[PDB]
Symmetry: C3
Subunit: 47 residues, 3 copies
Amino acid sequence: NAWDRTLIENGEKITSLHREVEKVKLDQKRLDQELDFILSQQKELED
Amino acid sequence: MNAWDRTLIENGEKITSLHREVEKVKLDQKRLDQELDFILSQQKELED
Amino acid sequence: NAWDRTLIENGEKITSLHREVEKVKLDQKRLDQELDFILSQQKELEDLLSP
């Protein structure tokens, strides 16, 4: 029925969404380190 | 009480929590984007 | 009615979150692409004169 269907997929999407979120936080941290090093990169070229 | 109720409620708790976390990684992505825009704008030539 | 309406709002919300996450994943992807380009660009530009 429509109720248990919604209640089951909501459960599956919550789990799924949490996992997309963690993968993104990871790439956020990697991208963030690239910025640090690109920053530093231009600054040493100024020499 | 009922398993039905409790699952609804707990999905409720789980969603509110994901909401904050998603607000968090949007703030961060926007922060990242504006830091690059800033780094690029600061590159500024001098040749020579 | 409160049960039904919590079921719907839950469904609406989690769906709206997937969309936000998707949108963030797209910006990340574009940002990663942009850094790859910048990295390639600054490799050429100091190979050209340094030190």
